[PDB]
Amino acid sequence: QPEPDMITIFIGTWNMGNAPPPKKITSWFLSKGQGKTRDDSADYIPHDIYVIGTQEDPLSEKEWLEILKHSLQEITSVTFKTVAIHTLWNIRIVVLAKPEHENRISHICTDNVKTGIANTLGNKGAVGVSFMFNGTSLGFVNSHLTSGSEKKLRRNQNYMNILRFLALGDKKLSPFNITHRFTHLFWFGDLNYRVDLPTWEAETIIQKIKQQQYADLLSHDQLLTERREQKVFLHFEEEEITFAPTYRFERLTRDKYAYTKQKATGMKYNLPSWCDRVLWKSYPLVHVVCQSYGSTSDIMTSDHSPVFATFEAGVTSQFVSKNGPGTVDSQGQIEFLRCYATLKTKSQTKFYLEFHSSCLESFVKSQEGENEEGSEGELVVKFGETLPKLKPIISDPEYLLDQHILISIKSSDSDESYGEGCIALRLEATETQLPIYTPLTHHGELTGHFQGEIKLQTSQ
């Protein structure tokens, strides 16, 4: 039975509006409704992994698990195994997988983050799950961010608190937040970004939705505009939205948007918005292709419609050689030439690099770089030809070309990371000097760049 080099992943996000679901929710898991939908010819083909994020979920874990498993069994005649379930207040994540994957999945982690302070601490935040699938690390975040059209900055702050403090993946990756710990990271939920148009335009917006003319609405979507201004979700992808706004509906129909201010809304308008979203970030040059992104039309218990997204995702096998794991493979090496970090910092400390990768026995610390002044004010940290030669555990190119090197640039004075990034070993050539590049972030914000050349030696 061969190990897969691709899997498909279903991501669902649904704000249930504190109401039990209807008796049938299969359209959700089938990616049927509006938007980029799944072909009918695939209906019986199970996804490998289903990740379900709910918000305002009134069910017990037991009650929801029974609905989800019975739904998937009806669709596929497969009894899915529960990988993980984690709930913070009414925010929940469930991971289910085909039984054949049970001994491919390990290192399962769960965590939550509570956002806000005092007033604003008590119902918003995120839950997450991570695990290894053979040689590939997968992370999943379900977040319910701050509501209200005039709170986009709060949502952006909630995002930064979640990526800083959610403790998933390999704890040995200590300089790295969740935006660098996984081969594939999926972040979804009721992100609560709104269509920023005047209140007086509510009926105009509704008209546009009825005509399936989303362009003038998406150009005011706060998540798209904040992402384009690099205020949030830097280096994450989202599929094009081709489904109607998923909020705020009258319950028990989808024929009506309920947008007017009411005591129940705190006297706030809820103009039709794409609150419910799926985004992802994968390591460079790993296969990830969105195969559906849309909303259901037939699940009407909530004032939100469920959202689905499906992905093909590249995976790798748990590689064993005669040599590594448990030793190095002298036929392998990674060299770095003409490397320099450009940092936005106003500080003057010495810096060194750390290289982290599961292709190394442990992380590698460089010598200090040489600081110069850039022509436009910047700090340039020159490593020249001074970086160590990295010694991978396995030299086989079928393994090594699929790996990645995480880079942290740290202050010698404080040992705090000023920037993190990632370099793919999926090179055009081996034994050849080739350009490399990564942006550097810290707390998910741009802090600089790392560039230079790489020379990769494999056993071939």
Listed residue (173, 175, 146) closest to 158, CA to CA = 146
Q: By C-beta, is 280 or 319 nearer to ligand WKG?
A: 280
**Looking at 84-92, 174-182, 221-229, 310-318, which segment touches ligand WKG (CB under 6 A)?**
221-229
Q: By C-beta, is 228 or 322 nearer to ligand WKG?
A: 228
- Under the criterion CB under 6 A, does residue 237 sit at the interface with ligand WKG? yes
Q: By C-beta, is 23 or 228 nearer to ligand WKG?
A: 228
Residue type, 87: T
**CB of residue 286 to ligand WKG, shortest distance in Å:** 14
- Under the criterion CB under 6 A, does residue 215 sit at the interface with ligand WKG? no
Locus of tokens 């498993």: 69
Taking CB atoms, the residue at the shortest distance from ligand WKG is: 227
**CB of residue 284 to ligand WKG, shortest distance in Å:** 12
- Under the criterion CB under 6 A, does residue 67 sit at the interface with ligand WKG? no
Measure the N-to-C terminal CA separation of the chain; round to a whole number of Å.
27
- Under the criterion CB under 6 A, does residue 228 sit at the interface with ligand WKG? yes
Locus of tokens 């705020």: 248
Listed residue (19, 20, 18, 37) closest to 295, CA to CA = 37
Question: What is the side-by-side order of every strand in the sheet holding 6-15?
Answer: 34-36, 288-295, 307-314, 6-15, 49-55, 91-97, 81-88
**Looking at 73-81, 220-228, 263-271, 294-302, which segment touches ligand WKG (CB under 6 A)?**
220-228
CA gap 174, 365 in Å, rounded? 13
Q: By C-beta, is 227 or 248 nearer to ligand WKG?
A: 227
- Under the criterion CB under 6 A, does residue 227 sit at the interface with ligand WKG? yes
Exposure letters 194-228 (e unless 16+ CB within 10 A, then b): bbbbeeebbeebbebbeeeebeebbebbbbbbbbe
**CB of residue 190 to ligand WKG, shortest distance in Å:** 19
Q: By C-beta, is 66 or 237 nearer to ligand WKG?
A: 237
**Looking at 38-46, 222-230, 368-376, 403-411, which segment touches ligand WKG (CB under 6 A)?**
222-230
Q: By C-beta, is 237 or 372 nearer to ligand WKG?
A: 237
**CB of residue 245 to ligand WKG, shortest distance in Å:** 17
3-state secondary structure of 200: helix
**CB of residue 227 to ligand WKG, shortest distance in Å:** 4
**Looking at 69-77, 224-232, 242-250, 357-365, which segment touches ligand WKG (CB under 6 A)?**
224-232
- Under the criterion CB under 6 A, does residue 398 sit at the interface with ligand WKG? no
Q: How many CA atoms lie within 13 A of 72 on its CB side?
A: 23
3-state secondary structure of 396: coil
- Under the criterion CB under 6 A, does residue 224 sit at the interface with ligand WKG? yes
195: DSSP letter: B
**CB of residue 455 to ligand WKG, shortest distance in Å:** 28
Q: State residue 152 phi and psi, 5-degree precision.
A: -60, -35
Residue 324, class by beta-carbon neighbours within 10 Å (0-12 exposed, 13-18 middle, 19+ buried)? buried
Q: By C-beta, is 224 or 337 nearer to ligand WKG?
A: 224
Locus of tokens 């997968």: 138
Residue type, 229: E
**CB of residue 235 to ligand WKG, shortest distance in Å:** 7
CA gap 417, 146 in Å, rounded? 29
Q: Which residues bind ligand WKG (CB under 6 A)?
A: 224, 227-228, 237
